[PDB]
Amino acid sequence: GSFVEMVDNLRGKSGQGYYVEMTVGSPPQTLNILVDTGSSNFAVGAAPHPFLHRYYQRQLSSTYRDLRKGVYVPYTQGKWEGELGTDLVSIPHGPNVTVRANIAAITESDKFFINGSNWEGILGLAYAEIARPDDSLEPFFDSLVKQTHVPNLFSLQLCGAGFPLNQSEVLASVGGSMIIGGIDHSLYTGSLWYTPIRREWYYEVIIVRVEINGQDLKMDCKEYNYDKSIVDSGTTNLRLPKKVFEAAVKSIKAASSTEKFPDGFWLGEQLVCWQAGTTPWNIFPVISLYLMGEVTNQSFRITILPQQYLRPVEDVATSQDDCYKFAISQSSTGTVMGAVIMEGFYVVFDRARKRIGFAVSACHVHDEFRTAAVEGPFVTLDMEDCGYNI
Numbered sequence: 474g475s476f477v478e479m480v481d482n483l484r485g486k487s488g489q490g491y492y493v494e495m496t497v498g499s500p501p502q503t504l505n506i507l508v509d510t511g512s513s514n515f516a517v518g519a520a521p522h523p524f525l526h527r528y529y530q531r532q533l534s535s536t537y538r539d540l541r542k543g544v545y546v547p548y549t550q551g552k553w554e555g556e557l558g559t560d561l562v563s564i565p566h567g568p569n570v571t572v573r574a575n576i577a578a579i580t581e582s583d584k585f586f587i588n589g590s591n592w593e594g595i596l597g598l599a600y601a602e603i604a605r606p607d608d609s610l611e612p613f614f615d616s617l618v619k620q621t622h623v624p625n626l627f628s629l630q631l632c633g634a635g636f637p638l639n640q641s642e643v644l645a646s647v648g649g650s651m652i653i654g655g656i657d658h659s660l661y662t663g664s665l666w667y668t669p670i671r672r673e674w675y676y677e678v679i680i681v682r683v684e685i686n687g688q689d690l691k692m693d694c695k696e697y698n699y700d701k702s703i704v705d706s707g708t709t710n711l712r713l714p715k716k717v718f719e720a721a722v723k724s725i726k727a728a729s730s731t732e733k734f735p736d737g738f739w740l741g742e743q744l745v746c747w748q749a750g751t752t753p754w755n756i757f758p759v760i761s762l763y764l765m766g767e768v769t770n771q772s773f774r775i776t777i778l779p780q781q782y783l784r785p786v787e788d789v790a791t792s793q794d795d796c797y798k799f800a801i802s803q804s805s806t807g808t809v810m811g812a813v814i815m816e817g818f819y820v821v822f823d824r825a826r827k828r829i830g831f832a833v834s835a836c837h838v839h840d841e842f843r844t845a846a847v848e849g850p851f852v853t854l855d856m857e858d859c860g861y862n863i
C-alpha cells in the first residue's frame with residue numbers, strides 16, 4: 474500500500490451509502506459526503522433539514538462565489554434543488570491539495586437525505602455529460618485533476634461488514650477506502666482485470682455473459698446492457714433490466730430450491746432470518762458477470778457470493794437471529810452494479826486509460842468454502858454487439 478493517508482478513509486454501509494469527509498469554504502467547514510460514481514454533481518445541504526445536524530453556510534465562507542443560477546437534480550430515487558456557486562474544497566484524508574470546485578448548495582430536497590446516514594452531501598464522480606444543469610458545470614474530479622498534479626484516476630474499496638452495524642458501531646467502523654490518484658495494493662488480492670469504459674458519461678461497461686453457479690443464463694447479451702450497464706456506488710443493489718431480473722431470479726430460486734422463500738423476499742422487500750450462525754450460504758449460488766476485456770475477443774469474469782447479494786439487516790425484534798434482504802432488484806434503466814457488488818471488489822476507475830479495473834477485495838465477506846473472484850481470460854466473440862444502441 475502506497476497511499477496510507479487515504480486507506481480506510483470511508484465510513485457507512487450498503488443501504489445508507491459510503492461517505493468520505495471533506496471540507497468546503499474558508500475557514501473550512503467539515504461535512505461528510507456520499508461517494509457516488511453514478512452521478513456528476515457535487516452538492517451539499519446548505520439549509521436546515523430534519524435529518525441534518527450540520528450544513529454548508531455560504532455566508533461564513535470568505536471564498537464563496539455565487540454563480541447566480543439554480544440547479545435541480547432528480548435522481549432515480551430522491552431529488553434536490555439548490556443554488557450554484559464555487560468554493561475551495563479539500564479532502565482531509567486524501568491528496569494534500571485544495572481546489573476551487575462547483576458546489577450545488579441544497580435548499581430543498583425530497584427523499585434525498587437519509588435519517589441517521591451521517592452524510593450531508595453527495596460527490597458525483599462520473600463525467601460532465603450527465604451533470605445538471607448541463608455539461609458546462611465541471612464535475613469535482615475534473616476540477617481536481619485540472620488544478621493539481623493528481624493523476625486522473627481513483628479507486629474504491631467498499632467494505633460491507635457481513636453483519637448489521639448499529640448507529641454507534643457504524644460511526645466507529647471503517648467502511649472502506651477511496652484512493653484519489655492511485656491504486657493501493659494492500660486493498661486487493663490477485664490480479665486486476667480491466668474492462669473498457671464504453672462511453673464517458675456514467676461509468677458505462679459491457680456485460681457479455683452471465684452465470685448462476687456456472688450455468689449460463691443464456692440470454693442475448695444485448696439484454697444484459699439494455700439500455701446500459703453502469704458501475705454505481707450511489708446505488709445499494711445490483712439492479713437488472715426487467716427480463717434479466719426475471720431470468721436471474723428464476724435461476725437463483727432453482728439453485729436454492731431446498732428452501733422456499735416468500736415472494737416478499739425475492740422482491741427485495743422483506744427480510745429472511747436464520748438462527749444465529751446458521752445462514753445456509755451454501756444453498757445460494759454464486760453469480761458471475763463476464764465483462765468485455767481490453768484485448769479483442771477476450772473477456773474476464775467477476776464472481777460474487779450470496780454474502781454480497783444478501784444484505785445483512787437487523788431483525789425487527791432485534792433478536793440474535795442473522796437476517797438479510799435480497800439485494801438484487803429490477804431496473805427500467807439498465808444494469809446498475811451497485812454497492813453490494815462493489816463490496817466484493819477493489820474497483821479502479823482509470824479515467825486516464827478509459828477503463829475500469831476489478832480485483833478481489835481484501836475486505837469482501839466470504840466463508841471457508843467459497844470466495845469472490847476475478848478470473849480470465851476467456852475467448853468471447855462479437856462482444857461489441859452486446860452493447861445497446863437506441
Ligand SMILES: COC[C@H]1CCCN1C(=O)c1cc(C)cc(C(=O)N[C@@H](Cc2cc(F)cc(F)c2)[C@H](O)[C@H]2C[C@@H](Oc3ccccc3)CN2)c1
Binds near residue numbers: 710
Ligand atoms: C447507496 O444506496 C443508498 C440507498 C438509500 C437511498 C438511496 N439508495 C439506493 O440504494 C438507491 C436505489 C435506487 C432505485 C436509486 C438510487 C439512486 O438514484 N442513486 C443515485 C445517488 C443517490 C441519490 C439519492 F437521492 C440518495 C442516495 F443515497 C444516492 C445515483 O446517482 C444513481 C442515479 C442514476 O444516475 C442519475 C440519474 C439522474 C440524474 C443524475 C444521475 C444512476 N446512478 C439509489
